[PDB]
């Protein structure tokens with residue numbers, strides 16, 4: 001598989017190798033704020049990241065992943081729409097070539113400059129590979145980024161990017177606190193969906209925060225200096241690594257807030 005984001009291998013082509021691309025619960029989606037309904041059944045959301053143990057940062061040719069130690073319940077997501085306990089495994093971003101695009105989810109068709117995905121897996125399935133085979137295997141916390149003031153807690157990430165410019169490069173990335181990437185409010189929208197890249201598995205409960213975080217133009221500029229290519233290959237800047245909104249089909253988006 002040679003999928004990517006270009007004219008020749010991008011989202012419009014993915015269905016040929018991954019027919020689920022045209023499935024019934026694909027992500028991302030547009031969040032129509034007028035039609036999303038408040039749900040009183042949602043329990044309070046619990047983001048418990050005090051004991052998170054970051055390990056490494058990896059350019060995988062599609063994004064960069066900050067990976068965590070998930071060999072025990074160190075950083076977990078619970079509550080909201082979720083039954084049981086979901087362990088943080090990694091986070092990554094999707095972003096644009098320009099400040100007016102880059103997010104995967106949209107809000108009333110508005111695109112943000114970037115979107116953060118904090119990936120968690122349901123511990124009842126024992127390991128991540130088993131969890132992605134289940135309809136309730138993953139919970140992804142999605143956070144929008146807008147350009148304005150710098151986000152202090154993002155700067156350690158920005159500053160290591162020079163060391164992982166190209167596909168396959170990694171760097172030690174210990175002692176990073178993901179709490180510094182969250183907005184003040186945990187108000188959210190939730191719906192059942194999918195991974196947003198191949199293999200496009202329909203295994204995700206999406207929890208998308210309403211409040212964006214602000215990052216500086218200089219911060220997002222540094223994301224845009226990354227490369228899709230490997231070392232020694234022609235330079236292809238890592239920009240516009242987002243999938244557009246997909247059909248909602250037979251789903252409702254629930255709001256946690258009145």
Ligand SMILES: COc1ccc(C[C@@]2(O)NC(=S)NC2=O)c(OC)c1
Pocket residue numbers: 117119132138140194195196197198199200
């Ligand atoms: C086989 O397991 C995979 C494969 C790819 C992704 C990445 C991604 O498709 N999904 C989200 S979230 N954004 C993405 O880019 C993944 O994420 C948990 C899990």
Ligand code: NA
Pocket residue numbers: 042043044045079080081256
């Ligand atoms: Na809730």
Ligand code: NA
Pocket residue numbers: 025135202
């Ligand atoms: Na399903």
Ligand SMILES: [Zn+2]
Pocket residue numbers: 092093094117196
């Ligand atoms: Zn993602």
